[model samples]
Target: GVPINVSCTGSKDCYAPCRKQTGCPNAKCINKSCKCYGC
Candidate 1:
């Protein structure tokens, strides 16, 4: 699995894709977890 970008304005609205549109800057998606894979 991969880490997904999500944004929740509050605890009500559905978590949609983050408008910032970014990937895990310091992590890698592996085995369904975002593991640290950065230098």
Candidate 2:
């Protein structure tokens, strides 16, 4: 169980770690933050 929070400076920053941790292949940087797609 985890609510991960990653501070992303750009779009690529968002998806990279999100992909690793949760297998989220695609995502967006919303207001400089990242959440796993569909989570």
Candidate 3:
């Protein structure tokens, strides 16, 4: 499986650890930012 790179910036918000409401469960929050897309 492809490892989900998560450079956690200590953002456990609904939109940080992962998107608030989306299918991108395996997301990466880096520098208090998050970008989720189906690769």
Candidate 4:
């Protein structure tokens, strides 16, 4: 499960930890991007 392109504006943004990475639980930004890890 790899969905990591968050071109978000409002209602929050994600995939925000670049230095300490664990990756993936569940996420949603929808049509703008980042419906993460729910494959």
Candidate 5:
């Protein structure tokens, strides 16, 4: 499978898609970028 790279302008954006795609707790966003595992 491919890596997770979702669009996120804020914390809510990050978790929203991340939660739907994978799981809420595992997803993360920093420096305005979202990545499941270094995406």
Candidate 6:
């Protein structure tokens, strides 16, 4: 899986697109960025 850096206020802000792209319900929030996990 590869992780993409995105701007987000919270995990929810990154969920929809991340889930759609990555199929992962969870997103990692770090340093004001969301790390989207996907295959």
Highest TM-score model number = 6
Query: What lDDT tens digits, residue by residue, belong to model 3 across residues 1-39?
Result: 233334455445434434534546545555654444342
lDDT by residue for model 1 (1-39), tens = 234422323311112222222422444333333333223
Off by over 4 Å in 1: 1-25
Best by lDDT: 6
Give the Cα-based TM-score of candidate 2 against the true structure: 0.49
| Count of clashing pairs, candidate 3 | 0
Candidate 6 residue-wise lDDT, 1-39, digit = tens: 445666777667677768877896567766577877755
Candidate 2 lDDT over residue span 1-39, tens digit each: 235555666667667766777785456556755665635
In the range 1-39, model 5's lDDT, one tens digit per residue, is 325665666667666666667764455565656675423
Per-candidate RMSD, Å: 9.8, 3.1, 6.9, 7.3, 4.1, 2.7
Angstrom error at residue 10, model 6: 3.4
Question: Which scores better on lDDT, 2 or 5?
Answer: 2
Could you give candidate 4's per-residue lDDT for residues 1-39 as a string of tens digits?
Answer: 453656645324554521123365355656667544532
Clashes of each: 0, 0, 0, 0, 0, 0
TM-score of 6: 0.56
Misplaced by over 4 Å in model 2 are 26-28
True lDDT of residue 3, candidate 1: 43
Worst 10 residues of 2 by lDDT: 1-10
TM-score of every candidate: 0.21, 0.49, 0.28, 0.23, 0.50, 0.56
* Residue 37, candidate 2: alpha-carbon lDDT: 65
The C-alpha lDDT values of all candidates are 0.30, 0.61, 0.45, 0.48, 0.59, 0.70
Between candidates 5 and 6, which one is better according to TM-score?
6
